Assembly symmetry: C7
Homo-oligomer: 188 residues x 7
Amino acid sequence: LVPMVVEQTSRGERAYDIYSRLLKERLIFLVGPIDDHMANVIVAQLLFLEADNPEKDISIYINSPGGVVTAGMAIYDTMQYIKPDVSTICVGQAASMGALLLASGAAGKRYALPNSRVMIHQPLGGFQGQATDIDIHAREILTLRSRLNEILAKHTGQSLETIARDTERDNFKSAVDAQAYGLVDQVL
Amino acid sequence: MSIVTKAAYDIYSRLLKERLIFLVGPIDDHMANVIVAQLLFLEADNPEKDISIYINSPGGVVTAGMAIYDTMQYIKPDVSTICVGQAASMGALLLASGAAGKRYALPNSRVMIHQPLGGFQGQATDIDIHAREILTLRSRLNEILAKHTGQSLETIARDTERDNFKSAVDAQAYGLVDQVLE
Amino acid sequence: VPMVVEQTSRGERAYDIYSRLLKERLIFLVGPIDDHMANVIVAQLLFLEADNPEKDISIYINSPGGVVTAGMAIYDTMQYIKPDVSTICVGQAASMGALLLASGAAGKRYALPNSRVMIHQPLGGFQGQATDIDIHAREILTLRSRLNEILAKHTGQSLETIARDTERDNFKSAVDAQAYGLVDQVL
Amino acid sequence: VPMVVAYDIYSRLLKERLIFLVGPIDDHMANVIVAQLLFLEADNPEKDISIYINSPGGVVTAGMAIYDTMQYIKPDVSTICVGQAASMGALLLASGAAGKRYALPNSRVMIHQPLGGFQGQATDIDIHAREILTLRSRLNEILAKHTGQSLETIARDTERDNFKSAVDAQAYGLVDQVLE
Amino acid sequence: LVPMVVERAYDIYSRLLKERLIFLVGPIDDHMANVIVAQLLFLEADNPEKDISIYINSPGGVVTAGMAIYDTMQYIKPDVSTICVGQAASMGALLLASGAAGKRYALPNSRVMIHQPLGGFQGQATDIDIHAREILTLRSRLNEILAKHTGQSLETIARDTERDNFKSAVDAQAYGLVDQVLE
Amino acid sequence: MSIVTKAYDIYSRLLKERLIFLVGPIDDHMANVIVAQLLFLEADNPEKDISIYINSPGGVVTAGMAIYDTMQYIKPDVSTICVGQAASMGALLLASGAAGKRYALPNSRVMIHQPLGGFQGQATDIDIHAREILTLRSRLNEILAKHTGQSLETIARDTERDNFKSAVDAQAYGLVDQVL
Amino acid sequence: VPMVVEQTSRGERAYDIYSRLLKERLIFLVGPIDDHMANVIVAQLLFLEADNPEKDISIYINSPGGVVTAGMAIYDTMQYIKPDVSTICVGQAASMGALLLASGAAGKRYALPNSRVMIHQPLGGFQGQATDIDIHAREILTLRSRLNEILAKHTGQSLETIARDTERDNFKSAVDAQAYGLVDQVL
Ligand SMILES: [Cl-]
Ligand SMILES: [Cl-]
Ligand SMILES: [Cl-]
Ligand SMILES: [Cl-]
Ligand SMILES: [Cl-]
Ligand SMILES: [Cl-]
Ligand SMILES: [Cl-]
Ligand SMILES: [Cl-]
């Protein structure tokens, strides 16, 4: 059950579920496993907010264990393409594609709360075909892995060699260690 | 009146006001007819303004995709296509079939023209799609792709047998989109 | 199913996309035919006739066919109501779906270029859908003949031609369907 | 279910005094039909009501609830068969107001009552043999009364699980007119 | 699908609730009983003087749920008329017979069975076992209620409730289970 | 908002009249909804009585205790009315209405007995241990003794038996004040 | 479940009972803690802060606990927002539920007389909820110590006392929870 609120607008009073009410504040929630359904809803929200004001910052709250790589890339490309800066805030956790999106927020505007944790490692499951008739072949997996490593090296400032070595490890960084690595700019 | 993110009500319906359609997930008759309905609605509301279809789809049923294809070509407005995430099979065919000059891909999206057997089989219990009809449809799909990409029929027929994804830049070079939005 | 919001005297209102097009006298006949969807189409035809008995109605058809008596409920309602019912095949029309396509108002039956049409009627459409109903062999043969007569009447083909061709479970292209008399025009 | 503006399509047609009896007959759909009939009577006890019937039949006492309500309310209840009417569906069709029972040209009508409609639908209810024979006779009497056939004829013919065409249903007295 | 009417929008049952009509339909259990109790209390508060009608088409069901309806019918100020359409069995039959004196009705092809099967008495919850002596107490209580409202003697009810046979509308009227067959 | 019996429902309309329905098994979900209605009613008017209609087989002890503590804490008097039955936690809450304002209808039944099932962990990772069960059983007995006027030894003996009391016997025992 | 409808000059507006209480700045933390309910609680906190950053917020807590990182999302949001967040235990609070109860604004943490509090954290709360995530032994130990430090800070107990007492999977009464520093007052 998602609670509702009633807010005054220029057009009169209107009812909102809590997430649509926070969308009016240019806040978007990326929560749970990443897949096409939820990634396309986030793409839709980013496009809508850009249409509403292309200059004002947008915030994505991230609490996600990661998930499907191409779904996460659709969010990534949309974040980069729209005119507004997209600020990222990790609460709870960001892993795999969740961590990649966190680290890809606008420079200076990536944040983690004190007890959140960040894991860059990309499990095989995120790369496999999600539809019954799609088999994702080894070379394409290797291309995607290098692509993700290059994106991380670029946004963190780490070298490519460093990202590719560290992404093999299946462990979490604390918010402070994630800030030190360049995955976020500030622990709030 | 009331607004939600997930079902000027839900986010998708608000963007439909902006002449934007989302083609997402597997293509089957249910979602293809919703897209046909959105296309016919937008043409009736304004037969002059462009329409955009965002495509993130692993493909699916061939006749359902052909329903979308025929509607796109038939209505008066130019239909622009944008690949986000991926486009495979019928999804790649539809991406390639947007209005000339108005087909786009985002930099990390991927495109695969290959059409698996599963798209051609009968979806209803009492329908059996026979081998000659499969070959006829595969050829028609190849000719549609040859026409919109500028590749020869022979090149399409050879390359569609491989089930590999192209990058967005490679898909532009192949003629499946006109521009990578970067 | 997306929504379309319009403002009015007393606030604003919301239609789903299908309801919005029903305002424009378009009906969607999509998916397998059964009693549930057939009665909804009958309800829409009756509503549009009562709203304006003079203006045409369009049914878009994308269907593999299905239950014969449910399709017959739609057929009789199309014939009975006052407005001309135009039909447009998008995707495919098989079995009862093809019969209803062919039964649109004369001159107003259409197919899109990549549409396909199959008149063949599989056994499954004729069998009992209810637990306590067993549809017997002679009734199947009788209904198969009634369907062939409807097709002969609307296509202009001989009953002998329809009976021969309906035994083959093969599709016609839009162009071949138009030449056969199943539609009047490829759009 | 499409909408018209704000009614769903069936509610919009209920405003025009049309009720849809569709699908298998059971207590749930019967009681919705009874409610609609009572509502329409209260709204206007003079104007005719129409019931569109497309149904394979079903539970006998649920059908009898509809039958008794059609007979009891003041408005004439016209019936129209679209698609098919079997078992209690056929009984209800034949029980519309005299002169106002219709069938469309390709509809079909079967008066036969399978054993399934008489059995207990609740777990703790067993419908016994003599009650079945009483109900079968009551249904036959209702059909003889509304069709004009003799009781003997109905009792013989109802044993066959065959459909009548719309024309043969009119000839038998199950409807007054085939509509074209 | 439950149709709607516009007058605001009402589903068909809420529209008829405005006309002080309640539908008791299907098997009786706590869920549906408490909804009927709420409708009775709502109608009493809206107008404690005007009659209420309950239409009953029910195979019966859980005894204590039915007793919740019975007690509420007796307690509220309005007369509660009952009308049997289709059938009334077990607790449904009891509730039909318990409408206000002179205002209990059956339609001509309605049927009524007072018999109470064992299933209505057993515990519906996981941790409740309804014991034999409590079943016997409740069976006697139901028989006393029927005797009071029908005018039959207690042992006449006890004899006839043992048989799981239906009464026609005419025979239910003759027995005192309703006052009138509406023709 | 549209109106139904089952948008604006019948229970919501009655909440406007300060009536709350406690119906069915007691668990966290329904108990938290009752706490919410109690807090809402107290904020709307802290002086007017509230009524809880109780028809319940009982259920989870800590869920019932959430309702109990909220009834005692809020300012309004909470009247309780048993319809159908009240067992276990349902009987405890009935017995805990405002003094003088606890009621039973003539055919309702009340069983104070607390089955083991109400005390066990409801979450997968919670094991409720034996000494905590004994502590809770004693607390519930103390609550019943206080509200009924019976001795603790009387409650402790009687709660062992999984038998129902009639409305008249519940009133005589002090579980309600009046049979209506 | 239930609705509250309020009349206005432009007709009627409707809430469910929880949304109506949200209007009074009360949030309900009920049932097992997981990402779904935790993100709903985070959103409610951020909304109430944006609506009025000065006024207190109350969380009613009736929970057997649950997923540790979901509860940590709520914890961090409670500490970050400007308003004081009061906590009230009704029923019970265990594991993450007990931690969040203890984490309300100093002096504004309450328990009702028959509620019970269990700080113990079962293994199940630390394990991966996602199919592709295995939460490893060293991360579990790190999270366990962090929870003990959070509890020590808010209760006033030493780290050693928390670490010893959290191993036992027993409940504290409301009065014992108050004496331990887990709430400030039994209401
Ligand atoms: Cl306003
Ligand atoms: Cl093939
Ligand atoms: Cl046969
Ligand atoms: Cl028989
Ligand atoms: Cl028998
Ligand atoms: Cl007979
Ligand atoms: Cl017994
Ligand atoms: Cl490990």
